[PDB]
Amino acid sequence: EDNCIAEDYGKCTWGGTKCCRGRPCRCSMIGTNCECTPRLIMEGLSFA
Numbered sequence: 001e002d003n004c005i006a007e008d009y010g011k012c013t014w015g016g017t018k019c020c021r022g023r024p025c026r027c028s029m030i031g032t033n034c035e036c037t038p039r040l041i042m043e044g045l046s047f048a
Contacts, residue, residue, distance in 0.1 A: 009035045 005012045012034045019025060019036040027034035030043035 005036050007036070008038060012036050 002016055002022050004020035005017055005025075010019065012019060012025040012026065014025065014034060021038075021040060023036050023039055025034045
């Protein structure tokens with residue numbers, strides 16, 4: 001009933017449901033419909 005939004009672009013709601021990775025959420029000029037924007041990622045490359 002209040003988990004965290006750990007999904008890519010997971011729809012959030014300025015009020016409680018915050019991104020699990022603590023990310024800056026934003027919305028439009030209506031006050032509804034928000035999307036978590038990724039802003040971290042690791043440095044270097046992937047496996048191999």
